[PDB]
């Protein structure tokens, strides 16, 4: 299967450094030109760098001399070494393959890896359950006071995916807070258990919170 997977993103301070990776699989990596394209928090897409099969490299002026792209045509991996990181380098970094046809376009993109440039320090989240006070019942999880983004949220380890949506994280007092909503048939709760899983990579946190009905 043709696929690209990026990794290495995280919280880095101004002037700091960070190296990102992109593992290619399913095609002859060495024959294709590759690129890194970033998406700012504003959702704007920006070309960062492109490296041809020939090894030639072209940088976006604003990162020229700070970023270093490279490739391991043996292990089929694309790298982006970043130095002197700035606030504006904050973005979702995407790895993309360039395909030629005798011209060129980006025909494959990976899921991206998040990079946040800031002096602020990491803060894990507090995870609280949201249980009701008659055919369906809605439950939820409150994930608050964490930094930086992102966090992942699943229900019952990802087996409970329908009737689920996560509200965007909102920044307030330099900390993010969001909540997740899950709706299931009332005839299966508290019967069949409902628990949300929350991970916050930056703080190496992984919390599971079971939504137990309030009695008292």
């Amino acid at each position: 299967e043709v696929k690209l997977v990026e990794s290495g993103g995280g919280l880095v301070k101004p002037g700091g450094s960070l190296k990102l990776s992109c593992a290619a699989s399913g095609f002859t990596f060495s024959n294709y030109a590759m690129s890194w394209v970033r998406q700012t928090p504003e959702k704007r897409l920006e070309w960062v760098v492109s490296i041809s099969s020939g090894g030639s490299i072209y940088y976006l002026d604003s990162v020229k001399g700070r970023f270093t792209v490279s490739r391991d045509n043996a292990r089929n991996i694309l790298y982006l070494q970043m130095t002197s990181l700035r606030s504006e380098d904050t973005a979702m970094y995407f790895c993309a393959r360039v395909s030629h046809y005798d011209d060129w376009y980006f025909d494959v993109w990976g899921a991206g890896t998040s990079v946040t440039v800031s002096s602020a320090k990491t803060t894990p989240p507090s995870v609280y359950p949201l249980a009701p006070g008659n055919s369906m019942v809605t439950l939820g999880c409150l994930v608050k006071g964490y930094f930086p983004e992102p966090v992942t949220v699943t229900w019952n380890s990802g087996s409970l995916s329908s009737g689920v949506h996560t509200f965007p994280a909102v920044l307030q007092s330099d900390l993010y807070t969001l909540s997740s909503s899950v709706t299931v048939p009332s005839s299966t709760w508290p019967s069949e258990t409902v628990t949300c899983n929350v991970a916050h990579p930056a703080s190496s946190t992984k919390v599971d919170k079971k939504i137990v009905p309030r009695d008292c």
């Binding site: 959702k43 704007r44 897409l45 920006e46 070309w47 492109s50 072209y58 976006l60 002026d61 995407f94 011209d103 060129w104 376009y105 980006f106 025909d107 993109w109 990976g110 899921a111 991206g112 507090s126 609280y128 359950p129 949201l130 249980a131 009701p132 006070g133 809605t138 939820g140 409150l142 608050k144 949506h165 996560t166 509200f167 965007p168 994280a169 909102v170 307030q172 807070t177 969001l178 909540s179 909503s181 709706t183 309030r214 008292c216």
Partner: protein, 218 residues
Amino acid sequence: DVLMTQTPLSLPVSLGDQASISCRSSQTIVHSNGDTYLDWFLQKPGQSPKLLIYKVSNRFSGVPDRFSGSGSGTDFTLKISRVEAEDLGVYYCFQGSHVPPTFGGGTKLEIKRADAAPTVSIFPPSSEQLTSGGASVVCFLNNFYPKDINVKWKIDGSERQNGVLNSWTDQDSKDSTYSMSSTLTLTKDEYERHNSYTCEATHKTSTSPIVKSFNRNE
């Protein structure tokens, strides 16, 4: 550098109707040969961009004929015939002709569906949170349309505004609805100093505001 300007910045459309998106460049984007390298990408929520059309009018593998591109000079247009809820996402134009390759700012396509009232649920602070000296009362307004909506909080019938935070989700790719959360944050001491917490939802689907609430008494 070549600047790509897209219009409209947002675009409502009903299922079956046609959608039109424009991209204007700061200069003509012809290449040395005689071809224009303008591409269109679609980025569905949570996913990464995906090529739809390239070189102005050529559809990419797996792209229906419902999608078409055209244009010349600095004006390019993407037309989506018979819109299906799945076409939901942010469309972006792009040119690779000149260095550096640049993208337009994007046009968000939203699906218009029949209005729908929300389904409101209120939740008391968790014992776990109360323990740490804080308290948050949450309210969910799920699967409604249009996106616009108001939320009022009341503590013992006495409307409260300070300390409220609302956040909306993007439009769902399934039912074309929106959902929003309202979170009233107060201290434990303050929270326990009262009893009747109410959450009222006012939406255009009714003059009557959907009301849900609870009491620390049960």
